[PDB]
Amino acid sequence: GCKKLNSYCTRQHRECCHGLVCRRPDYGIGRGILWKCTRARK
Numbered sequence: 175g176c177k178k179l180n181s182y183c184t185r186q187h188r189e190c191c192h193g194l195v196c197r198r199p200d201y202g203i204g205r206g207i208l209w210k211c212t213r214a215r216k
Contacts, residue, residue, distance in 0.1 A: 181211045 176191035177183050183196040190211035192198050197212045 177211045179211060181214055182208055183211055203206050 175196065177196070178191060179194055180200055183189055183191065183195075184207075185196055188196045193214060194211040195214040196209050197199050198200050199210045202208055202210070
């Protein structure tokens with residue numbers, strides 16, 4: 175199943191559910207470059 179809102183992912187392979195987007199992390203910006211999905215806006 176795709177990734178949900180604020181779900182861990184990578185900008186190299188988008189796997190977020192329709193509507194969301196694999197963007198940088200929220201509060202986790204110290205361990206690896208883990209990008210968290212975010213509710214896009216269009």
